[PDB]
Amino acid sequence: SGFRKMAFPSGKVEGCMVQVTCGTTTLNGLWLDDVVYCPRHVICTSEDMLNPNYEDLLIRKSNHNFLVQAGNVQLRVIGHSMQNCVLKLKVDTANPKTPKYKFVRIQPGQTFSVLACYNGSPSGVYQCAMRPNFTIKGSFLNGSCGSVGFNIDYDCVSFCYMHHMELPTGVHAGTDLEGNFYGPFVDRQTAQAAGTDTTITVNVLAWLYAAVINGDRWFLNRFTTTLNDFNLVAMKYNYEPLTQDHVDILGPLSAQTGIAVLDMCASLKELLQNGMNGRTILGSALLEDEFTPFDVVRQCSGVT
Amino acid sequence: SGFRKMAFPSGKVEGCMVQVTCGTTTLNGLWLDDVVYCPRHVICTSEDMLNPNYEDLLIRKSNHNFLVQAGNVQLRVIGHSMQNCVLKLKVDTANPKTPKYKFVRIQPGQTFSVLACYNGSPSGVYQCAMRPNFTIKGSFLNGSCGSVGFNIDYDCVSFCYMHHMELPTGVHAGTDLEGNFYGPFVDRQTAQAAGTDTTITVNVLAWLYAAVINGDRWFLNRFTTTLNDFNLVAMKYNYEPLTQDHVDILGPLSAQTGIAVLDMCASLKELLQNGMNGRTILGSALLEDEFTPFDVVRQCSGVT
Numbered sequence: 093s094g095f096r097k098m099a100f101p102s103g104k105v106e107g108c109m110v111q112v113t114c115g116t117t118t119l120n121g122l123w124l125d126d127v128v129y130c131p132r133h134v135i136c137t138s139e140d141m142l143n144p145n146y147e148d149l150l151i152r153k154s155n156h157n158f159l160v161q162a163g164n165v166q167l168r169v170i171g172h173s174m175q176n177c178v179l180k181l182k183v184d185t186a187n188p189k190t191p192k193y194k195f196v197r198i199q200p201g202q203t204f205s206v207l208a209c210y211n212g213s214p215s216g217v218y219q220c221a222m223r224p225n226f227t228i229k230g231s232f233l234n235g236s237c238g239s240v241g242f243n244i245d246y247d248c249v250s251f252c253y254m255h256h257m258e259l260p261t262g263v264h265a266g267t268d269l270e271g272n273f274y275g276p277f278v279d280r281q282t283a284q285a286a287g288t289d290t291t292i293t294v295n296v297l298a299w300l301y302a303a304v305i306n307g308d309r310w311f312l313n314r315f316t317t318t319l320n321d322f323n324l325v326a327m328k329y330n331y332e333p334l335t336q337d338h339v340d341i342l343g344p345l346s347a348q349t350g351i352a353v354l355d356m357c358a359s360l361k362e363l364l365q366n367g368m369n370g371r372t373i374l375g376s377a378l379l380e381d382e383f384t385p386f387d388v389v390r391q392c393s394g395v396t
Numbered sequence: 397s398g399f400r401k402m403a404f405p406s407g408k409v410e411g412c413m414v415q416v417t418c419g420t421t422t423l424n425g426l427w428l429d430d431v432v433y434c435p436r437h438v439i440c441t442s443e444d445m446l447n448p449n450y451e452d453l454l455i456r457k458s459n460h461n462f463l464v465q466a467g468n469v470q471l472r473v474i475g476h477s478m479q480n481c482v483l484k485l486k487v488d489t490a491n492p493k494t495p496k497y498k499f500v501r502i503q504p505g506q507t508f509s510v511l512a513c514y515n516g517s518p519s520g521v522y523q524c525a526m527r528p529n530f531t532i533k534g535s536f537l538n539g540s541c542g543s544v545g546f547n548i549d550y551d552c553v554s555f556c557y558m559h560h561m562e563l564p565t566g567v568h569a570g571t572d573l574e575g576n577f578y579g580p581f582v583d584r585q586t587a588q589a590a591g592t593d594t595t596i597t598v599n600v601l602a603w604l605y606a607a608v609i610n611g612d613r614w615f616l617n618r619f620t621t622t623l624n625d626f627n628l629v630a631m632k633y634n635y636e637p638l639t640q641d642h643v644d645i646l647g648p649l650s651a652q653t654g655i656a657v658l659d660m661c662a663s664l665k666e667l668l669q670n671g672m673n674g675r676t677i678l679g680s681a682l683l684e685d686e687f688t689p690f691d692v693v694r695q696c697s698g699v700t
């Protein structure tokens with residue numbers, strides 16, 4: 093009973109957080125095996141951030157300029173390289189706490205947990221989603237750069253995000269663990285605007301199935317729709333167009349509840365056209381889109 | 397920038413989760429030093445739960461009947477006792493991962509993180525609040541009993557909750573780590589109804605201060621109020637009455653923003669009387685009450 097915005101247990105990621113200092117800039121690093129991953133802007137001063145030439149700035153840096161501290165002990169840096177927008181610092185010690193891991197580049201609409209860190213120390217964990225405009229609505233202050241996003245499948249941590257930037261609109265931009273930014277953002281102190289933040293339709297439907305499973309059924313109506321009719325409504329409300337791929341992934345939820353995907357689409361259509369009318373669904377007064385169909389299945393079944 | 401419902405990093409609690417089996421019932425245990433804490437209803441069959449006499453049921457149980465498994469290794473049980481609604485299983489090995497810890501009985505309105513577990517394995521972490529009717533709106537399925545609630549102050553874990561029950565209304569009831577239930581609930585399969593779920597006023601105000609700090613200011617008005625005038629409105633909307641103690645704890649937020657507590661109360665009063673008018677605050681279309689003033693301060697300052 094009950095449905096919560098749950099994050100993955102963070103322990104496996106906590107054992108990987110280190111502090112990286114270069115000059116007078118300190119941020120977070122991710123220590124996996126004998127490599128520490130961190131945003132390349134760690135080599136920048138506030139002035140450098142205006143228009144940095146990272147290759148040129150890196151020439152003035154040696155292995156001894158990167159100070160890596162795991163807890164209260166100093167790691168010896170024996171190599172450094174730049175891969176896209178991340179720095180890989182080869183250390184002389186493999187992290188004894190390295191979990192089974194993969195680096196994955198996620199698609200917009202996918203969810204993940206963020207372990208927010210400051211000075212290599214964790215402050216908290218929350219569940220996020222890569223928005224369709226490639227930003228994340230996180231909670232990050234100065235010093236939080238290098239904090240990571242991830243998913244867990246039993247014992248394997250799939251790292252998907254590394255925090256780099258706060259846009260002037262308070263939304264967040266970052267990279268995958270290969271250093272490639274999600275979206276068109278660059279690691280520069282220049283005004284970069286985000287595109288339309290559309291609603292992740294398939295996630296809203298998955299959350300409506302979670303609500304039915306947990307007792308909230310008032311929004312179920314006597315109607316059905318078609319993908320094309322539904323998508324005309326989704327276009328009007330800045331919702332992502334629903335495809336047969338999305339319908340397919342909702343299949344297990346449609347099967348468990350006995351509510352056909354297109355019937356749930358008609359409920360969503362009426363909710364979009366009429367609003368909630370002062371009512372709530374799973375304790376929310378708006379349509380939640382940061383639960384994927386896989387998250388709903390996982391939570392509703394007790395996957396550990 | 398940004399404000400999220402954050403949970404504490406769960407690592408320190410993950411290293412304490414064990415599986416406890418008695419007969420054919422399996423639930424979660426908390427292993428701290430050489431003691432494993434678990435709900436006493438682990439000794440019950442589904443039939444026993446209807447009207448259990450725990451002292452009588454415990455007589456038919458020996459140390460060897462309690463199977464404690466931490467990961468894939470079996471702990472030897474050398475003692476067992478019942479303290480209120482929890483069983484304390486003395487094991488022959490101190491948990492090497494025992495963090496610095498305290499057992500605290502929280503007050504209604506206080507928030508905490510829950511590490512949801514199944515068969516001694518964690519499934520996720522989420523932030524909760526002890527409701528004013530002493531229930532929690534968690535996310536727990538069968539097998540989740542023994543999962544714990546906690547807060548962290550730097551390196552010390554204050555355990556405050558242990559999950560025991562799901563009421564017929566899908567809300568959750570549990571105990572502190574001394575085995576005393578929050579509220580009037582009993583560990584029996586008998587219909588127990590919850591009292592009025594009032595809104596935690598001081599938490600809503602703290603969240604309104606977080607919203608101002610983060611850019612959402614539309615709800616700020618030209619009015620002020622008094623504690624007595626505000627409380628007449630709070631009574632009507634089933635909000636907890638605000639006291640000078642609550643005003644005092646909001647002080648640092650009033651000081652940082654320059655918005656007097658009673659002015660924020662007048663904004664809250666207008667929001668209660670007029671609604672949001674299709675608008676949102678920190679991405680929510682309702683007034684959030686599961687952030688204490690301490691949580692807002694912590695998140696907005698970067699406490700690790």
Ligand SMILES: Cc1ccncc1NC(=O)[C@@]1(C#N)CCOC1
Nearest residue numbers: 133232233234256257258280281
């Ligand atoms: C101040 C802050 C808070 C949260 N996330 C990110 C930031 N800051 C940034 O985006 C930086 C830029 N541009 C400033 C230093 O290099 C990265």
Ligand SMILES: Cc1ccncc1NC(=O)[C@@]1(C#N)CCOC1
Nearest residue numbers: 437536537538560561562584585
């Ligand atoms: C089914 C479930 C799911 C989540 N939390 C709790 C429960 N169940 C309960 O409350 C129990 C009772 N009464 C059933 C066995 O003893 C505790």
